[PDB]
Curated annotation (Swiss-Prot), chain A:
Protein name: Multidrug export protein EmrA
Assembly, per entry: Homodimer and homotrimer. Part of the tripartite efflux system EmrAB-TolC, which is composed of an inner membrane transporter, EmrB, a periplasmic membrane fusion protein, EmrA, and an outer membrane component, TolC. The complex forms a large protein conduit and can translocate molecules across both the inner and outer membranes. Interacts with EmrB. EmrAB complex forms a dimer in vitro.
Organism of this sequence: Escherichia coli (strain K12)
Function statement: Part of the tripartite efflux system EmrAB-TolC, which confers resistance to antibiotics such as CCCP, FCCP, 2,4-dinitrophenol and nalidixic acid. EmrA is a drug-binding protein that provides a physical link between EmrB and TolC.
Compartments reported by the entry: Cell inner membrane
Entry's family note: Belongs to the membrane fusion protein (MFP) (TC 8.A.1) family.
Swiss-Prot record, chain B:
Encoding gene (name): tolC
Function as written in the Swiss-Prot or TrEMBL entry: Outer membrane channel, which is required for the function of several efflux systems such as AcrAB-TolC, AcrEF-TolC, EmrAB-TolC and MacAB-TolC. These systems are involved in export of antibiotics and other toxic compounds from the cell. TolC is also involved in import of colicin E1 into the cells.
Deletion phenotype: Cannot grow on efflux substrates novobiocin or fusidic acid.
Taxonomic classification: Bacteria, Pseudomonadati, Pseudomonadota, Gammaproteobacteria, Enterobacterales
Residue range from the parent sequence: 130 to 183 of 493
Coiled-coil blocks: none
The protein's name in its UniProt record: Outer membrane protein TolC
Homology family: Belongs to the outer membrane factor (OMF) (TC 1.B.17) family.
Compartments where found: Cell outer membrane
Entry text on domains: Forms a continuous, solvent-accessible conduit: a 'channel-tunnel' over 140 Angstroms long that spans both the outer membrane and periplasmic space. The periplasmic or proximal end of the tunnel is sealed by sets of coiled helices.
Subunit record text: Homotrimer. Part of tripartite efflux systems, which are composed of an inner membrane transporter, a periplasmic membrane fusion protein, and an outer membrane component, TolC. The complexes form a large protein conduit and can translocate molecules across both the inner and outer membranes. TolC interacts with the membrane fusion proteins AcrA, EmrA and MacA.
Length: 49, 54
């Protein structure tokens, strides 16, 4: 969507919303990463026995 | 011929009034669309359509 915006051939609200969606997706990925890290802190030994 | 010529004038009057009403409506439409484009909700392409209709 970005290049079309350089010219005035796409609504500015739509580009704003695309940017916001990117940011939200990044934040949710961070949430998932932190959950995985939280679980990993209990089994960091790397040996079952 | 006299009767037909007489009635054509009233027909023209009616047509003129209704065309003026249409002009008012379309002008208000163009005003709304241009304001919306300025505020940043529509593209320039939609402004051209309103101008053409006007």
């Amino acid at each position: 969507r970005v290049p079309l915006g350089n010219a005035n051939l796409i609504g500015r609200e739509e580009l704003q919303h695309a940017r916001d969606a990117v940011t939200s997706a990044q934040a949710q990925l961070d949430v998932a990463i932190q959950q995985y890290n939280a679980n990993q802190a209990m089994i960091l030994g790397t040996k079952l026995e | 011929n006299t009767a037909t010529a007489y009635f054509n004038v009233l027909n023209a009057i009616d047509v003129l009034s209704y065309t003026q009403a249409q002009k008012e409506a379309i002008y208000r439409q163009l005003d709304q669309t241009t304001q919306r484009f300025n505020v940043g909700l529509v593209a320039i392409t939609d402004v051209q359509n309103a101008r053409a209709q006007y």
